[PDB]
């Protein structure tokens, strides 16, 4: 209550028509259903059941999320970007001596190190970040944890200090845009990480023919 | 009017004709950016004109 009323005075007024009258607002309702293909459901998973379809939405979101991290992981690692220091001081494993190759990084990294990565995912999957059935699919970060959230009507700030509220349907800033862009970059990275695996299986280059 | 697949896709991008911010809007911020752009354009003109001589900047043909 205190120190919050300056936002209302800094809030920019609602958009109107140029003549002076109030502006009249005058297919794609689900996240992942967007212009190019619309609802692309060749196998009709939505017809299998509401519980089965909710499973596939969380499954696409989770698969797409790890694929984006996996793609970004290889791209920095294959470039030569490394953390400073030792990955394993007991095994004399500097980061510089771990190969940029996906199979090379999968093999050189100690199994005790891989267990720590897996157990962190197990801890997140089983206790810390569980999907609440009441919550939206993919919303696994609990309250209290610092997460970038974009609720309907959240505030953004301009040069003079003026405040604009961003609706869900806003371009590049609404929740639906960021939700759609997460699913699509997840879908593109899902094909990307599998393509980088098979290209490196055949040639040894994850980004073949680039490089 | 004809409805096409691409036309239905691009339809919300052309659906806000005549929508304005009431009053002066963000004209004050725009004037600041215009004033900063004017000062910036004068700087790079006077550098080229050698009316502003910087410390390690020599306006002459460089090597490599």
């Amino acid at each position: 209550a205190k120190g919050r009323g300056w936002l209302q005075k800094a809030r920019i007024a609602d958009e109107i028509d140029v003549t002076g009258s109030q502006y009249v607002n005058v297919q794609y309702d689900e996240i992942g259903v967007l212009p190019p293909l619309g609802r692309w459901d060749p196998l009709n998973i939505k017809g299998q059941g509401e519980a089965r379809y909710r499973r596939f939405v969380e499954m696409e979101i989770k698969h797409g999320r790890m694929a984006m991290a996996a793609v970004l992981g290889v791209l920095t690692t294959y470039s030569g970007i490394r953390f400073p220091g030792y990955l394993s001081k007991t095994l004399d494993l500097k980061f510089e001596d771990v190969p940029g190759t996906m199979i090379g990084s999968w093999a050189t990294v100690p199994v005790t190190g891989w267990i720590q990565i897996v157990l962190f995912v197990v801890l997140l999957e089983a206790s810390w970040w569980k999907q609440d059935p009441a919550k939206a699919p993919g919303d696994v970060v609990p309250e209290g944890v610092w997460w970038a959230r974009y609720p309907d009507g959240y505030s953004i700030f301009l040069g003079d200090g003026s405040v604009k509220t961003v609706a869900e349907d806003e371009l590049f800033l609404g929740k639906t845009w960021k939700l759609n862009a997460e699913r699509n970059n997840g879908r593109a990275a899902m094909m990307g990480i599998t393509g980088m695996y098979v290209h490196e299986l055949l040639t040894g280059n994850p980004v073949y023919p680039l490089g | 009017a004809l409805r096409t697949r691409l036309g239905e896709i691009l339809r919300p991008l052309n659906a806000e004709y005549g929508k304005v911010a009431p009053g002066w809007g963000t004209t004050s911020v725009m004037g600041v950016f215009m004033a900063l752009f004017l000062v910036f354009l004068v700087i790079i003109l006077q550098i080229y004109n050698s009316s502003i001589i910087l410390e390690n900047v020599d306006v002459d043909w460089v090597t490599v």
Partner: peptide
């Protein structure tokens, strides 16, 4: 020099992608 930046791969994939999207959007709405 002909193999630089992926060779002919990106122009072939890029041109095929543009042609496929045009054919995808060419049909009538209903």
């Amino acid at each position: 020099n002909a193999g630089d930046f992926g060779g002919y791969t990106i122009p072939i994939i890029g041109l095929g992608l543009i042609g496929a999207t045009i054919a995808l959007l060419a049909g009538p709405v209903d």
